[model samples]
Target: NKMEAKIDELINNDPVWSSQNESLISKPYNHILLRLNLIVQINRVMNLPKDQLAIVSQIVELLHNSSLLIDDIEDNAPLRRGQTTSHLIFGVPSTINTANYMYFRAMQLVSQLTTKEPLYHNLITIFNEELINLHRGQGLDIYWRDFLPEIIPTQEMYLNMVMNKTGGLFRLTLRLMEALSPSHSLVPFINLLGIIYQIRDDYLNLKDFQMSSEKGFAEDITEGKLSFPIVHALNFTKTKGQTEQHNEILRILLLRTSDKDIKLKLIQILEFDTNSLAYTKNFINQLVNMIKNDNENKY
Candidate 1:
C-alpha cells in the first residue's frame, strides 16, 4: 500500500534516482521477481511490523536493481528482464553513475529502517559486510569469465563463489530480518537455498536456452561464464579422458557466439557427451531433498 507511495516518493523526490533515463531499473525478470516473493513470504514469517518491512523490502529491491545495472554493464549484456539493458538505453556513463548513486541512496534509506543509533549501526554493519562479500565473489566470477580458459574453477570453487555472490544477498535479507526478525541461523538453510537457487539457474539457462525462455535467453553460453552445468560437463569430459570433447567445449565457450545452432550443439554435448545436464538435475534434486528432509531439520 504505502510501500508504493514510499518508493515513488523516495525515487522521485531525489533528482538522482530514476529520472527518465535510469527508469529501467524498475523491477522483475524471473530471478529478481522470485527474489521479491521470497522476501514477501519471509516477511510473513518474520512478522516485522509491515511498516519497517515495507522499507526493508524496498531497500533490498532497490539494492538488487542497482546491482543489476552494474552487472549488465559488466556482462556487456544486450538485454535484461526482456528489454534492452539500462546501460544500453541510458548510456554506460549515466547508467553506472546512476546505479552507483542508487547504492548510496539505499544506504541512506537504511537509516529509516530503525530509529535507535545502536541498532542503526548494526544494520549498517550487516549491509556493509554482505555487499563486500558479494563483490568479492563477483570479482572472482568476472575474473573467471574475463580471463576464461585461464582458470577453470572446480565445483568447490564455484560454491564458494555462490555463497559470497548469490548467497550473500540472501544472507543480507535474512540477517537484517533476524536482527529485526526477532529470530538464525536458518542461515545454513538459507545458504543451502542459495546454492540450490544458483544451480537451478545454471541448469535452466542451459536447459531452456531455447526460445520462449527469455531471461536473456541462453546468454550464459554467450557470456562464456562458468555456470554450474557447464562446469560439471567440463569436469566430466576431462575425467572420462574425452580430451577431444573437453577442448571442443572450451572452443565453443571461447566463441561466445549468439548462434542458436551453436548453443544447441553445446547443449547436445552436455546432454549426450557429458551427461552433465542430467547430473545437474539430480544434484538440484538432492539439495532440495536435503531441504525437505534431513539437514534443514537441524536448522
Candidate 2:
C-alpha cells in the first residue's frame, strides 16, 4: 500500500497528472503501451541484448506516446484510438508540456542502454537523427496541408515524405536494435515497410472515414492532410484536364467539413473521377510485391 501510495504521489505531483487527470493522461499512454508487443516480438527474433531491451522499448514508447499527444493538438484531432485524445481531456498546454517532458525522459534512458562511450554516443546519435527526421517530415506535411493549393506534392515527393516521417520511427527502432544485435541489414526493408504503412494510413483515412464507428474517420479530411491518394488524385485530375473536378477536390479539402456526405463525396471523386483509390491500391500492391520479390530472391 505504501509503495502504491508513493507511486501515486509521484505521478500526482505533476501538474498534468492529478488523480482527476490521471485517467485522461493514462488513456494515450496505455493505448500505445498495449501495442508494443510487436517490438517485443522483433527484439526476441533479433536477439537484442537482453539487458537493454526493456529500456529500449520504453524509450520508443515514450517517444511514440508523446508524439501522438502533440500530434492530436497540432491536427486539432477529436479522437485517438477510438476515444477522446489526451489533449482534449487535459488541455493542449498541459498535454504538450507533459509530452515534451517525456521526450527528455526517453533521452535519459540512453545512458542505461550502454556504458561504453562509443556505443552510447552512437545510440544517442541515432535517437537525435531520427527525431530530427521525424520533425522535418511532420513539418512538411503540416505545411502542405495548411497551405493547400499552394503546393500539391507529386507522388515521388509524397513517398520521400513518408520515408522521413513514418520511416523515422521504424528506422529508429531498427537501427538501435541492429546496433545492439549482430544484424544490420533491415534498413531497406524497414524503410519500405514505413512507406507502405503511411500509404495505407493515407488510404484508410478516406476508406474508413465513413465506415468505422469506434474509430474516428477522416480527420485527415478535416486537417486537410495531403495524403497519398489525395496527391495522386489531384495530379491525375490536373493532368487529365478535369479542371472543375480538380478545383472541387481542393474546395472540399479547404472546407474541412465533419459532414459525412461532403466527405463521402470527396472520396467518391477520388474513387470515380480520378480512379485514385484503385490507383493507390494498385500502387500499394506494387510496393508490397517488390518486398515479396526481395524475399523470394533471398531464398
lDDT of 2 by residue, 35-65 (tens): 4686777777688766678888888888988
Candidate 1 on 15-42: residue-level lDDT in tens? 5544454454432222233366888787
Model 2 weakest 10-residue run by lDDT: 26-35
Off by over 4 Å in 2: 1-35, 182-184, 210-216, 296-299
Q: What is the TM-score of each candidate against the true structure?
A: 0.85, 0.86
Which pairs of residues collide in candidate 1?
A: 177-181
Strongest candidate by lDDT: 2
TM-score of 1: 0.85
- Model 1, which residues run further than 4 Å from truth? 1-34, 182-184, 210-216
How many backbone collisions does model 2 have? 0
